[PDB]
Amino acid sequence: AKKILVTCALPYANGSIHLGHMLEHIQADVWVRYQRMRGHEVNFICADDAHGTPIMLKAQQLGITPEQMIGEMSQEHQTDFAGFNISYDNYHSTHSEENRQLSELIYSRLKENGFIKNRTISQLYDPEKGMFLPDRFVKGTCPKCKSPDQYGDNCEVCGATYSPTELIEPKSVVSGATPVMRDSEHFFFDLPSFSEMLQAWTRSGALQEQVANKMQEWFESGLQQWDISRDAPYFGFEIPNAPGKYFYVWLDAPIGYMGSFKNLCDKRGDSVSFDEYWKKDSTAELYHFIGKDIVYFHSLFWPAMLEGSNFRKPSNLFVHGYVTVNGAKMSKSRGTFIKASTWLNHFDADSLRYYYTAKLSSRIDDIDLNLEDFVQRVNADIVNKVVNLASRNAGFINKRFDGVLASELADPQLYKTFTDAAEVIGEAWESREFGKAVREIMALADLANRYVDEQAPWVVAKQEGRDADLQAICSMGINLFRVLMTYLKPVLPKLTERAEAFLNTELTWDGIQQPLLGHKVNPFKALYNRIDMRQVEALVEASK
Ligand SMILES: [Zn+2]
Numbered sequence: 209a210k211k212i213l214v215t216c217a218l219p220y221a222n223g224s225i226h227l228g229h230m231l232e233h234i235q236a237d238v239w240v241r242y243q244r245m246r247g248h249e250v251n252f253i254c255a256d257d258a259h260g261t262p263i264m265l266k267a268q269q270l271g272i273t274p275e276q277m278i279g280e281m282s283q284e285h286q287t288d289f290a291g292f293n294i295s296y297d298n299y300h301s302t303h304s305e306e307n308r309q310l311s312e313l314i315y316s317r318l319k320e321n322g323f324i325k326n327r328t329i330s331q332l333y334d335p336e337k338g339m340f341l342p343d344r345f346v347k348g349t350c351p352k353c354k355s356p357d358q359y360g361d362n363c364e365v366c367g368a369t370y371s372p373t374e375l376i377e378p379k380s381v382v383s384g385a386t387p388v389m390r391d392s393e394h395f396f397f398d399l400p401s402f403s404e405m406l407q408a409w410t411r412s413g414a415l416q417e418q419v420a421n422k423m424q425e426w427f428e429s430g431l432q433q434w435d436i437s438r439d440a441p442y443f444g445f446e447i448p449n450a451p452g453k454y455f456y457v458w459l460d461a462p463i464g465y466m467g468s469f470k471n472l473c474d475k476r477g478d479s480v481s482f483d484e485y486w487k488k489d490s491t492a493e494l495y496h497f498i499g500k501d502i503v504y505f506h507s508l509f510w511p512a513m514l515e516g517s518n519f520r521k522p523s524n525l526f527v528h529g530y531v532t533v534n535g536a537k538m539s540k541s542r543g544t545f546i547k548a549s550t551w552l553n554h555f556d557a558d559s560l561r562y563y564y565t566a567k568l569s570s571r572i573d574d575i576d577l578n579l580e581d582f583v584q585r586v587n588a589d590i591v592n593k594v595v596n597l598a599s600r601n602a603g604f605i606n607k608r609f610d611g612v613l614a615s616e617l618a619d620p621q622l623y624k625t626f627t628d629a630a631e632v633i634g635e636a637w638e639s640r641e642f643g644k645a646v647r648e649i650m651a652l653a654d655l656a657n658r659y660v661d662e663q664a665p666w667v668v669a670k671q672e673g674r675d676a677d678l679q680a681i682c683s684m685g686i687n688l689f690r691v692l693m694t695y696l697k698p699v700l701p702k703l704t705e706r707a708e709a710f711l712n713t714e715l716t717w718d719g720i721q722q723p724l725l726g727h728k729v730n731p732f733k734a735l736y737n738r739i740d741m742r743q744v745e746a747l748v749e750a751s752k
Pocket of ligand 1: 350351352353354355363364365366367368
């Protein structure tokens with residue numbers, strides 16, 4: 209009966225979805241699907257992060273409007289996520305009217321409350337193009353080793369780091385012009401004002417221990433004010449009362465979580481839910497699934513901005529680690545930098561969903577996709593443990609018993625062992641201990657296959673007068689399958705649909721307390737096929 213708003217980080221609009229994104233969106237989707245199974249009101253919200261200088265420049269290079277460009281990438285992203293069955297209630301954009309109005313509102317409130325500071329800064333400027341240059345749009349000669357054609361604040365030959373103002377013979381990446389230092393007034397959010405509140409949240413015990421520890425490092429270094437403005441030319445929202453100034457993505461990106469929810473409420477004609485979820489007095493829960501690299505932002509800047517503008521703050525942050533492939537960071541040269549779209553040409557979504565889920569936990573630790581292990585694990589667990597219980601038993605039921613399951617459980621004690629596990633497995637899904645949940649489910653699958661082996665239906669089937677025994681054994685196996693697929697429903701949506709078609713019933717969490725007795729099942733082709741290393745080799749080759 210809880211009200212829950214869950215987000216994933218907003219994908220950047222100038223890059224395709226890859227396996228790293230998928231770790232995050234799959235983790236969130238599994239959790240969301242479980243929460244829905246337990247009867248809660250869930251709103252799963254995301255959007256593309258569509259503003260900024262890189263996006264403006266990319267569109268100019270392509271000779272199209274930034275609006276056309278981000279629209280095309282939004283569609284590409286949503287197609288990929290739909291391919292993996294990520295069950296958003298809304299997927300919006302930071303380039304939207306809802307986000308504009310909320311960004312303006314929040315800024316206005318921050319300013320009225322004394323949290324916006326004005327400061328003049330100096331930055332490299334391209335006088336030919338007529339724009340300030342972000343660091344990575346400045347190139348030149350390393351001041352230390354004198355290597356040419358180095359970009360931004362570091363040299364890829366000697367490893368030195370420096371301000372781009374130290375580059376020798378600097379050039380604009382945009383125009384080739386020599387950049388010069390120029391002053392500009394910027395607006396800053398007074399994050400340090402919120403230090404005590406943030407420190408109290410850190411010690412409150414809600415956050416992951418690893419996150420709280422990192423936060424202590426940040427408090428120790430000392431909180432800084434953060435620039436929330438950019439000069440024209442820009443692709444984004446103009447700041448009221450400040451001609452030629454725009455909101456930097458730091459301000460408008462997370463407000464996209466709010467804008468996406470407002471968009472959903474407005475499309476639904478729901479005039480009460482936005483305030484019910486975002487006002488200070490809210491009894492709804494708000495959760496953000498995010499990666500390591502955006503924790504400072506979500507744990508410090510974001511709750512401060514919300515407090516300073518009279519909105520509720522996150523109930524919790526759920527942080528995951530990086531994805532690796534074959535033990536290492538994704539590598540383009542090795543073909544392990546793998547796009548979501550590419551993945552689906554070779555494998556189904558369920559396979560990756562399962563593999564990631566089996567490795568995930570409540571900690572921040574990197575998650576490794578070892579491709580050899582992926583083949584082994586999917587075949588061993590999905591094909592040979594879980595689906596096996598249906599595939600080894602359904603034929604006899606269909607061919608010899610007209611599709612009808614036995615009128616009573618052959619082994620009620622064993623069935624009770626399976627249903628008794630619901631509390632611990634659900635608690636594991638709830639606490640994000642996904643690996644624990646999968647281990648418990650697979651231990652049950654081992655018990656189920658041990659039961660079938662003990663009963664030896666391939667022997668019973670050939671022996672005169674043992675029809676009743678055969679129906680009993682096979683029906684028991686199918687009932688164990690029903691339970692396991694219920695526990696795995698958040699993980700494997702497509703296999704679940706196929707299982708529900710076979711069983712002639714929707715799988716509900718509470719439904720397992722009533723086994724299927726005197727009940728017609730349907731024939732099926734093949735619920736889940738084996739994979740092989742040849743397919744992996746093809747995936748890698750296609751990714752090079
Ligand atoms: Zn160098």
